[PDB]
Amino acid sequence: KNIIIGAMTALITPFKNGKVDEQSYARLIKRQIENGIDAVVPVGTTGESATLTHEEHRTCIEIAVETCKGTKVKVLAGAGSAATHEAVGLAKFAKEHGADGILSVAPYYNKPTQQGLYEHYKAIAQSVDIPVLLYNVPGRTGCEISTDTIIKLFRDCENIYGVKEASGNIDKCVDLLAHEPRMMLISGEDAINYPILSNGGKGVISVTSNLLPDMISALTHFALDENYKEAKKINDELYNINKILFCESNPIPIKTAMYLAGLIESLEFRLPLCSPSKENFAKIEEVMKKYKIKGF
Amino acid sequence: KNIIIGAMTALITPFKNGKVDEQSYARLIKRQIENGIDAVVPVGTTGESATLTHEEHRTCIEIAVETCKGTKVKVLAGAGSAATHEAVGLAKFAKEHGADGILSVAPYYNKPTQQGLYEHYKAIAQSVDIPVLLYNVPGRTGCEISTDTIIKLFRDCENIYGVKEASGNIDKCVDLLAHEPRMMLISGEDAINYPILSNGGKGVISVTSNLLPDMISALTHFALDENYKEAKKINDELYNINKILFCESNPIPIKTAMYLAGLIESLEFRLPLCSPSKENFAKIEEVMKKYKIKGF
Amino acid sequence: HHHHHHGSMDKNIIIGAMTALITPFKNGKVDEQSYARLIKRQIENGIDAVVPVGTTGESATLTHEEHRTCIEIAVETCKGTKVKVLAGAGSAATHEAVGLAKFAKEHGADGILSVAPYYNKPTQQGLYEHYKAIAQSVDIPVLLYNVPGRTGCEISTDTIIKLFRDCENIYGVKEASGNIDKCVDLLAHEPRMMLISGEDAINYPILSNGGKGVISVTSNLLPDMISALTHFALDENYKEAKKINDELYNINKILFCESNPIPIKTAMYLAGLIESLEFRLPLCSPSKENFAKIEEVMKKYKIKGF
Amino acid sequence: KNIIIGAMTALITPFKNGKVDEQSYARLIKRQIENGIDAVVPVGTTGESATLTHEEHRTCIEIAVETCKGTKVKVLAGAGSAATHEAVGLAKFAKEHGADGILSVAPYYNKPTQQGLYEHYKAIAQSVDIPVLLYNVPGRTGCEISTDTIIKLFRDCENIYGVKEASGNIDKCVDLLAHEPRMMLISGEDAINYPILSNGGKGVISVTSNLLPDMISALTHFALDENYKEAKKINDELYNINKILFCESNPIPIKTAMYLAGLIESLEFRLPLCSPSKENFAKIEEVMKKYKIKGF
Ligand SMILES: NCCCC[C@@](N)(CC[C@](N)(CCCCN)C(=O)O)C(=O)O
Ligand SMILES: NCCCC[C@@](N)(CC[C@](N)(CCCCN)C(=O)O)C(=O)O
Ligand SMILES: [Mg+2]
Ligand SMILES: [Mg+2]
Ligand SMILES: [Mg+2]
Ligand SMILES: [Mg+2]
Ligand SMILES: [Mg+2]
Ligand SMILES: [Mg+2]
């Protein structure tokens, strides 16, 4: 299978006057490239995919593709939906805009059965000829892609090559790679990046890497090179910031931190997201001081 | 406050060859009207709101509004979204096209904070002058509207008049009505319709009533009259069908039951929803045989 | 031989308003005089039964001798009254639970409460055999007790109903499970059983669905209010029962701001009803902030003295 | 600190005609010693601690102490209780009868607060001069020793040197060793032995090792030697048996497997534990066929 692995960043989407700040978006991607990141994920959960329009979805994918052009850095475009017809359309558009592959979150809200998830992802994978990474995050979607369903999809669909797990379930991570060691298991939970990689996971799709791309990329590369002691050292050092970045729903903390670090102009969200509480604003700022934040 | 209470049905959306079957949709609503139902909810969760287009959403609301004219039956239009801008747009459409009120599910997938939920619903409520019922279903959305947030919205926004709860949490139901007895608590979980009503809830938004509208209407009206012996008797008798209608994710079982009773022409869903397993198909049929199902 | 048709055969029951008694300590010993005085106060404020050495009575840290002494005081104090003694007798070990059941029978308890085995997580078959052994060891009523947040296991509706139908003296269940759906499930499929509320905040919803009593924490502090709530409900005066349930919500919830019985003993101490705020380790006093919160919530209520 | 780490077995307690089979118990321990195990845990959860008398509990500890004489194998005696006075008494017995350390499960059923847990373990630790390992298993006890409480106990009490985690929470495993790298984190969940060891855990207290002691010992020793690839290979191979040994509550499956293997004479439990279902008995037998089970 063709794959997209390594250290990847779920890009925030900066807003300016209620609009996507396209100059800031490109500038933030160049900063990721300069700090060792292997791929960027425009318009995932961290990029506020649910509140962007389709036009804005396209704009972000195009900026990511153009900015990464000529670098080794790939674009794994967010393209999931609760509706299969919409997810198929987003997959086809992402392929046409030049994306290297697609990330596709399990349908949220409508709780498809395992048979329904299989048909959903089979339809998506059949619509394109680029790699497709499944994305399991049951705390947000209300459903779980089972290990059996993930493995069946990997085996039955040429394009489907692994899964981004955001499920707090290292047992499932063992289950997946013990029964199907050819798949690419990707960490979707920064605090446990190292345990997922040390069990044979092959990358991360990170929130923390927005702020500390050098540290998350180094963690990932240490682990892929089997230097577990050094990968664990960075994972341990990052625990405090990894946890505070979820003191409110992601991406409220990471955007707050990027604004405090001077990396975006304006702490703007799209409703129903909004600024953190005064107390959590202070906690994020405090945890940040313990880390060296790369500039532009 | 202007309110919409009583026995209400979360309408299924029939499909025929991939499109909304508009003749069947109207016929099903007339059947609800003729069996004692007080309001109908087009394009809620049970109506596959997440997989309908904007145009189909609007078509279903218009059919409901037209079919309920000249009757006492109200239209409480589904209008929720994960994006506040889209929820406001749907609210405004429902108002301008004659809906009596709106139902608005808590944003799914993006997990807004309580402050974000407050701002989300304040924007929706300020956009229309018709009643707004909140809708909490954490198992599907990934978030909870807290009791404090529900009560503040009810007290701060003239047209927010209560909440549809689908949370399995009778403690919260007591909390809500003990601290704000003027709100309209609406049961969103059929199996516990009677306990919610007997604590002072004032209606149901029912899945089971698609199949058995006369029974749910009678349960509700006995309860509103404090004829609790009779209301509990029906609630007890309905437990088996109330539970089997969730043997797979709603609306897979209820649409299956409607098809099995000849009330819709085709067992068609929009992906990622799909037909139930053959085993559950048979289980639903066997439970149906214990109930008296009205025709057209 | 055994059989599956006990459901409509005569079952002695213990229902109504019941109190899960705190166990007061003085210098680390059971304060036996205070214990009797607190029970008399329950009797005089309309309570129908008392539960010595349940969860609220710190059953896990009493010695077997102290457990037996508390049952004896409860039995002696309730003689000559309408008030029944439903003795705590559960255990993670079936052999211990049988021994406690037999003691309660031989020392004059009216019935036993028997919590689902904690920590060892028996299967539903194991729970069935556990309670079959207990029920067949005595001839007094047995109330099952489901509290999965504490035990790590659940007695399923099907197992509860099987036990009710298969054993003469098992007559119902005390539910502390935050699960009104299960409460409907139970009484819809087996309306002959006695469902007893084990969670004060939802006493009225359980009673209004046909539950027939409560085993209360709040009634340690406010026995007249819990008794009135229950008797109104049993008479189908649901307006008055709900009014009391709503008024009690604040205290009902603050009594669990830390693990029960830490808040209720704190409230009883603040009310002057016990001499010292003494627990047995690993239980201990609440945080200073929760101490203050409990004190504040109490102010809205009229607390009966002795 | 003095410590007890490495590959350890939570010993089953065999019964014959309702009594502890003392000869089988000693024979089973010798089998563990001869298959690479570093310590044995008499009368833990797997040993049916809840249904043994205090006399039987003490007998099992004495047999373990006697059988390990003349070997490097340590006895980490089960000594926990919901009552602090009982836990202190069991700790003092274990010390005075030659145990090398104690395992002490968090109080079950009565849900102490973190302050209560601290006072509980402080009292236990001060009662003896041998190592004390905390044991967190919230699914069984109804409470959780927080990371902060574990770390305070480790720092404040000379004897307390780590924690056995059976919590399905690799995030907390990271939390513990990131903030207090000097403690000994011990895996209490066989399926994730390798992830816990690869994060710097220093041992296991295993159920599976009752049946497959050579494989669990080899896994643990490869990990401790930083041969993570070979440790992961065994962890992956063992996943199927690791999971089937929990198809019913432990120790129902492990005793079933030991009986099927001819390692214990009769499939006897103490109520409320009992035989598995016919169906799960067959599932256990089938999974066993893929593994080489050492004899005596
Ligand atoms: N990635 C950019 C598009 C975001 C679109 C949408 N806001 C709504 C998508 C929708 N399928 C719209 C249904 C409209 C009829 N009710 C949904 O709400 O699930 C979402 O996916 O959350
Ligand atoms: N109700 C008064 C007696 C309390 C006894 C005990 N503390 C311990 C009971 C025991 N079966 C003892 C096991 C002894 C060997 N470890 C238990 O801990 O489960 C409990 O049940 O929690
Ligand atoms: Mg690279
Ligand atoms: Mg809605
Ligand atoms: Mg008497
Ligand atoms: Mg039945
Ligand atoms: Mg009367
Ligand atoms: Mg509570």
PDB file of C-alpha atoms and ligand atoms in Angstrom, chain C residues 161 165 189-190, ligand 6:
ATOM      1  CA  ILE C 161     -36.402 -11.538  38.540  1.00  0.00           C
ATOM      2  CA  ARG C 165     -39.378 -16.238  41.117  1.00  0.00           C
ATOM      3  CA  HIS C 189     -41.583  -7.504  33.704  1.00  0.00           C
ATOM      4  CA  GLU C 190     -42.104  -8.413  37.391  1.00  0.00           C
TER       5      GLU C 190
HETATM    6 MG    MG E   6     -40.259 -11.722  32.476  1.00  0.00          MG
END
